[PDB]
Design a protein around this motif. Structure first.
Motif, PDB file in Angstrom:
ATOM      1  N   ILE A   1       0.309  -1.061   0.219  1.00  0.00           N
ATOM      2  CA  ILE A   1       0.038  -0.265   0.674  1.00  0.00           C
ATOM      3  C   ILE A   1       1.232   1.566  -0.121  1.00  0.00           C
ATOM      4  CG2 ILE A   1      -1.682   1.628   1.473  1.00  0.00           C
ATOM      5  CD1 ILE A   1      -2.901  -1.491   0.207  1.00  0.00           C
ATOM      6  N   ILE A   2       1.076   1.929  -0.908  1.00  0.00           N
ATOM      7  CA  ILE A   2       1.261   3.473  -1.382  1.00  0.00           C
ATOM      8  C   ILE A   2       0.820   4.474  -0.597  1.00  0.00           C
ATOM      9  CG2 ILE A   2       2.845   5.059  -2.483  1.00  0.00           C
ATOM     10  CD1 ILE A   2       3.108   2.728  -4.871  1.00  0.00           C
ATOM     11  N   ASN A   3       1.517   5.638   0.397  1.00  0.00           N
ATOM     12  CA  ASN A   3       1.076   6.578   1.236  1.00  0.00           C
ATOM     13  C   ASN A   3      -0.689   6.062   1.475  1.00  0.00           C
ATOM     14  OD1 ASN A   3       0.681   9.746   0.022  1.00  0.00           O
ATOM     15  ND2 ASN A   3       1.062   8.809   1.560  1.00  0.00           N
ATOM     16  N   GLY A   4      -0.429   4.620   2.216  1.00  0.00           N
ATOM     17  CA  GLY A   4      -1.456   4.355   2.953  1.00  0.00           C
ATOM     18  C   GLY A   4      -1.281   4.894   4.626  1.00  0.00           C
ATOM     19  N   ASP A   6      -1.156   3.471   9.209  1.00  0.00           N
ATOM     20  CA  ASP A   6      -1.016   1.313   9.651  1.00  0.00           C
ATOM     21  C   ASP A   6      -2.908   1.726   9.728  1.00  0.00           C
ATOM     22  OD1 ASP A   6       1.275   1.719   9.694  1.00  0.00           O
ATOM     23  OD2 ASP A   6       2.119   2.520  11.699  1.00  0.00           O
ATOM     24  N   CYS A   7      -3.341   0.657   9.709  1.00  0.00           N
ATOM     25  CA  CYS A   7      -4.653   0.288   9.762  1.00  0.00           C
ATOM     26  C   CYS A   7      -4.791   0.540  11.344  1.00  0.00           C
ATOM     27  CB  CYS A   7      -5.049  -0.882   9.770  1.00  0.00           C
ATOM     28  SG  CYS A   7      -5.054  -1.195   7.841  1.00  0.00           S
ATOM     29  N   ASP A   8      -6.406   0.277  12.251  1.00  0.00           N
ATOM     30  CA  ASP A   8      -6.079   0.167  12.854  1.00  0.00           C
ATOM     31  C   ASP A   8      -6.297  -1.032  13.646  1.00  0.00           C
ATOM     32  OD1 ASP A   8      -6.666   3.333  13.414  1.00  0.00           O
ATOM     33  OD2 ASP A   8      -8.141   3.451  12.546  1.00  0.00           O
ATOM     34  N   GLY A  53      -6.031 -12.529  11.313  1.00  0.00           N
ATOM     35  CA  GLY A  53      -5.498 -12.240  13.155  1.00  0.00           C
ATOM     36  C   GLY A  53      -4.876 -11.932  13.512  1.00  0.00           C
ATOM     37  N   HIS A  54      -3.798 -11.575  12.531  1.00  0.00           N
ATOM     38  CA  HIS A  54      -2.805 -10.476  12.679  1.00  0.00           C
ATOM     39  C   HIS A  54      -2.365  -9.734  11.980  1.00  0.00           C
ATOM     40  CE1 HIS A  54       1.719 -11.642  12.621  1.00  0.00           C
ATOM     41  NE2 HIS A  54       2.109 -12.114  14.020  1.00  0.00           N
ATOM     42  N   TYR A  55      -1.297  -8.745  13.026  1.00  0.00           N
ATOM     43  CA  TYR A  55      -1.733  -7.322  12.888  1.00  0.00           C
ATOM     44  C   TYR A  55       0.171  -6.922  12.415  1.00  0.00           C
ATOM     45  CZ  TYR A  55      -1.710  -2.063  13.220  1.00  0.00           C
ATOM     46  OH  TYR A  55      -1.836  -0.925  13.341  1.00  0.00           O
ATOM     47  N   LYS A 136       5.515  -3.052   8.074  1.00  0.00           N
ATOM     48  CA  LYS A 136       5.822  -3.145   9.693  1.00  0.00           C
ATOM     49  C   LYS A 136       4.129  -3.788   9.952  1.00  0.00           C
ATOM     50  CE  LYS A 136       9.187  -4.477  12.057  1.00  0.00           C
ATOM     51  NZ  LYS A 136       9.269  -4.626  13.041  1.00  0.00           N
ATOM     52  N   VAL A 137       3.502  -3.128   9.798  1.00  0.00           N
ATOM     53  CA  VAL A 137       1.862  -3.430   9.361  1.00  0.00           C
ATOM     54  C   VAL A 137       1.237  -3.378   8.649  1.00  0.00           C
ATOM     55  CG1 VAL A 137       2.473  -3.531  12.745  1.00  0.00           C
ATOM     56  CG2 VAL A 137       1.123  -1.604  11.339  1.00  0.00           C
ATOM     57  N   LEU A 138      -0.182  -4.260   9.114  1.00  0.00           N
ATOM     58  CA  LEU A 138      -1.366  -3.759   7.572  1.00  0.00           C
ATOM     59  C   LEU A 138      -1.501  -2.210   7.529  1.00  0.00           C
ATOM     60  CD1 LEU A 138      -2.751  -5.960   5.959  1.00  0.00           C
ATOM     61  CD2 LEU A 138      -5.299  -4.892   8.098  1.00  0.00           C
ATOM     62  N   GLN A 139      -1.680  -1.660   6.291  1.00  0.00           N
ATOM     63  CA  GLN A 139      -1.538  -0.584   6.046  1.00  0.00           C
ATOM     64  C   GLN A 139      -3.535  -0.624   5.074  1.00  0.00           C
ATOM     65  OE1 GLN A 139       1.112   2.175   5.536  1.00  0.00           O
ATOM     66  NE2 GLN A 139       1.055   0.402   7.425  1.00  0.00           N
TER      67      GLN A 139
END
Ligand SMILES: *[C@@H]1O[C@H](CO)[C@@H](O[C@@H]2O[C@H](CO)[C@@H](O)[C@H](O)[C@H]2NC(C)=O)[C@H](O)[C@H]1NC(C)=O
Length: 227
Positions: A1-4, A6-8, A53-55, A136-139
């Motif tokens: 994901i570009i320019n996104g 970190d998801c909550d 279920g993994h961030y 590092k984490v879901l974008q």
């Protein structure tokens, strides 16, 4: 994901990751049924694992996390090795998922996306292009659906009805590593990361996603036939 961004945490409990031994994160996927995932047909693999279920991206242990194996892969019959049409596949898990706040399926919208619709796309794909840089984490990234007409101009003779374009804002787009990932609009699964121009995020060059609204029946029938 570009320019996104970190998801909550805990949001997107339907987001799945397709891993390869040891822990090579290839393609994303989406839980659409207690025992069924959805992903791009071009993400087909013979041997692989399923992480839900993994961030974070790394195999760093997390509570709420669940691991499975792909027991059966069914790509849509219309998917052609060269063309990008019918870019969706069903994956059956070895067992039903354990419903938690971190692992929950999402419904597939029967209504197709109309221009202007704001959607949410996510994935552990590279955040830079052409230079590789995994997060590092879901974008997470918001993207608006374009009119099929505009979609056709940007990609003449290659854009199809089983797909749709999304993402007008500059520098924002999906990229390598996000394929098979979910595109959520109005609280339901509207598409999957399929393809786009390269390098990613080029102006006036929106990402192309599988138009799931065209396969609700096939998805349901296939699931029922293999239950
Ligand atoms: C994507 O866009 C949506 C819609 O604007 C954003 O949702 C808002 O999230 C905030 C939390 O910061 C809420 O207070 C608002 O109520 C939400 N908007 C509404 C009315 O739905 C979302 O934050 C955006 N996410 C990203 C990754 O940009």
């Amino acid at each position: 994901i570009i320019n996104g961004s970190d998801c909550d945490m805990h949001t997107q409990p339907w987001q799945a990751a397709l891993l390869l031994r040891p822990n090579q994160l290839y393609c994303g996927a989406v839980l659409v049924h207690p025992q069924w995932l959805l992903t791009a047909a071009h993400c087909r693999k013979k041997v692989f694992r399923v992480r839900l279920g993994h961030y974070s991206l790394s195999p760093v242990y997390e509570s709420g996390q669940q691991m499975f194996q792909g027991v059966k892969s069914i790509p849509h019959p219309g998917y052609s090795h060269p063309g990008h049409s019918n870019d969706l596949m069903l994956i059956k898990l070895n067992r039903r998922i354990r419903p938690t706040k971190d692992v929950r399926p999402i419904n597939v919208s029967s209504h197709c996306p109309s221009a202007g619709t704001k959607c949410l796309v996510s994935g552990w794909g590279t955040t830079k292009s052409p230079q590789v840089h995994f997060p590092k984490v879901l974008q997470c990234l918001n993207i608006s659906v374009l009119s099929q007409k505009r979609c056709e101009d940007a990609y003449p003779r290659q854009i199809d009805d089983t797909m749709f374009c999304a993402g007008d804002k500059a520098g924002r787009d999906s990229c390598q590593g996000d394929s098979g990932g979910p595109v959520v609009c109005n609280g339901s699964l509207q598409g999957l990361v399929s393809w786009g121009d390269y390098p990613c995020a080029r102006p006036n060059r929106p990402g192309v996603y599988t138009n799931l609204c065209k396969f609700t029946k096939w998805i349901q029938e296939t699931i029922q036939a293999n239950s």
